[model samples]
Target: RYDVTLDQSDAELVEEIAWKLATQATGRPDDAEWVEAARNAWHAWPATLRRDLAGFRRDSGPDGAIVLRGLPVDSMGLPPTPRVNGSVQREASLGAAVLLMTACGLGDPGAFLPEKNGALVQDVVPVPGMEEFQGNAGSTLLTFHNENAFHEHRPDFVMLLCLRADPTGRAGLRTACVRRVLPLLSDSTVDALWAPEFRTAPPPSFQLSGPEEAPAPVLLGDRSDPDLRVDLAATEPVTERAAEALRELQAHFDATAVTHRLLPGELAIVDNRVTVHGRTEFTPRYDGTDRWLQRTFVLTDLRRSRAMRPADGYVLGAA
Candidate 1:
């Protein structure tokens, strides 16, 4: 696994850069000036940190995930976790700036229109009426899935910054990577997964007006180090062999998954192409104070999503 805990001095440097970018933005993350300022400030990060981030981008380590701890937070007072869309102003928090800056280290931050109303930065707080839901707003155990797997231009990386942890601290973010599970899979199962007999439907949160299905193989790319794309909750196997293979893959994830209870100031980045992520069940008081996290999606090549986004914008237009 790739893990880094910044010392006090390095942490302060990051704080200063984030504060500067946050103060300069004075607007939304998608603003042209704000985006440019964030990209520029990213260059000011400690050379060692930038180097490590570059390496992580190139190859997401054996675990296909990066854990960064002891980053700056609490410079500004945080508002109550938003229960609905447009409730929180993301640019108002310095932590949001830190997230954007950190994402710039990897690539350009982007979002899907049907999720969180296309906000560049989205709030991941449990909603009162959504306890039984399967999306981020739910308090129940979230099933493992590749973020935006139903979309053609899914994010390459997904960044999450924790602002508040669950009161009991029992909630955990779980990750399972193909790199770690490939050797454990049987040759027959791998071959079955490589066939294009799997399909994933958009989650309810996406609110797609029409029924849209992303039909594709469970594994893609190189045979030895293939990429994974499947949602345990939304994916439907089209054949008996495919279904059996999917079950086998799920069993591997259940037996080998890594869990982390993210605290304030901790950031976890997942390589969407090689890993799938989920969350454990947690209790939410919902009395204004509860577990909250900020999320952003990144793309290695922004131009690949140019057609989906408007002119000079990061939020993707409706499909």
Candidate 2:
């Protein structure tokens, strides 16, 4: 299981300030307060700390996910920062930045990095999903997935900082904890899974582009903490035994899951190895005011996974 800690002070401050700035309605030619608040928050960090943070760079995770809890989120009433222009609130963006810091080993070894340019940089925009898909990109219920579960260069740690959640405050962002999910297995199924008897198809995007070969072993590496390279959509059992194992694994996750709705300023860093995460279905209004979350990826200890990566810091094809 992954460790869950709270930073409280620093993380909370960052969240509160950012939320204030994001709600100011700046960014448009007419309004400047929003932009100013955002800017001020970005510059609000102490000079020494900022320098320390700048020194660190983002790295990739073996499982491609990283999380930081208790960053900043004063209130949930503010509208989400517009995904279009570059003027979105800055304080609200601190979680992304802090994550990058951690990935790069800045602040404390535990200090998170906000994806910047170098090894740590925030992605271009918030990942958006359609309302028809149940949860809009910002809404939780981000299914049990490995991010790009089928991609070769998938993130080892997908860091998500909750800025806001659904009004209902449901435990929709449930994750299938590997520790608990592993017990429901039958001896035979576990033995089969321990073997490399399954294959993972390319991601959905792969099919649209063309046919590509899938990778074997929905579960890979050694037994201690075998890497989970599963894509519920793409994985297929190669044999009856393997198929049974996969089915059992899914059942376990379904039965015993860790469900939680991330709170404002809370960071959830997932260990892609110890577990594969999924979410239950969630509702979204798509009014640009739905649940909003900031996500970033980190490649931890780049030297460790260097051989497995391409020059771009990402692995290509299916892993």
Candidate 3:
């Protein structure tokens, strides 16, 4: 993975940027005013960081993910992790400011109206009753999947910025990129993957959108370095070959996966098109100091989802 740590000065600069955005982007991070401010604020980020972001946007490396370390998340005081069922970061905090700023630099911040109440910044903390679930609220082993893999307009990038670490320090963000697994894939498996012999269901987190899923190929575009889309738990094979291929792919993913135990100041950005992400099982204390991460989805081209957004805003929903 492309991992970079911010220097002390850069971290301080990021904190200043976050503070300014928090002040200007008052009320809620999802508010149109705040979203607009964040878009403008992306330009104010450090030049080196901006350049690196541009490079990553153009072509995410072999790992198809980036880990930015030593951010200024601590500049914003954090409260105890909430046990609420559907938690989100509505108010623009310093942590949210930094997230949105990076979101804009990548493309535009976005969300589904039915998901987490359409908040631009959502909490990825473990909930009390959702431990066994496959969604973000769960602390159990989350299977690898391209975030929102079933959607035609799935996010181009998924950003997870750590606000708090798991009490046991065992929770880890697991990533497996197709780049690493491709070489190990069998010829028949690759051929089967390129065919439309699979269907992925919409995640439980998403509200009613489409009742039925259309058959779609797991690998798309180009024979080499193709885009991968699959949710291990939700995607189902329509053919026996597809099942065999999926099994082969999963084994390759296991062999090539990378585990990242993110700290308070680390951020992991996954290129959803070419990579899949999951979480390792962790024992949450159910106390105040549980693992907490704030997430923001990004699109490389906001105009692509124009029909779904009202007045060309960030949130994509029924227009």
Best by TM-score: 3
lDDT of 2 at 62: 32
lDDT (10s digit) by residue, model 3, range 1-319: 2788998888888888888889766567887778778878879888988888898988898889999998877634678887787799887787788888899899889998878887889999889888988889998899889988888889999999998988797899999999999988999999999999999887768743345478889999978888999988889999999999999998888788899998998999999999999899988899889998999999988899999998887778864
Evaluate residue 192 in candidate 1 and report its C-alpha lDDT on the 0 to 100 scale: 89
Per-model TM-score versus the true fold: 0.95, 0.63, 0.96
- lDDT value, candidate 2, whole model: 0.48
What is the lDDT of every predicted structure here? 0.82, 0.48, 0.87
Sort order, TM-score high to low: 3, 1, 2
Q: Please identify model 2 stretches exceeding 4 Å from their true place.
A: 1-69, 74-92, 106-143, 205-215, 303-319
Candidate 1: residue 207 lDDT (0-100):
68
Total backbone collisions for each predicted model: 0, 60, 0
What would the C-alpha RMSD of candidate 1 be, to one decimal place? 1.8
Q: TM-score for candidate 1, please give it.
A: 0.95
What is the full ranking by lDDT, best candidate first? 3, 1, 2
Query: For candidate 2, lDDT tens digit of each residue in 1-319?
Result: 1333444555455555544554443552112333234334556644533443343223223322333344654454546544441222234334434443344332111112111211222322223443222122333344455555545545656566666665554435555655565455787877887776767654442233234345366656766445666756556777899877877887776776666667676666665555567665555444554455555554455445445444524222222
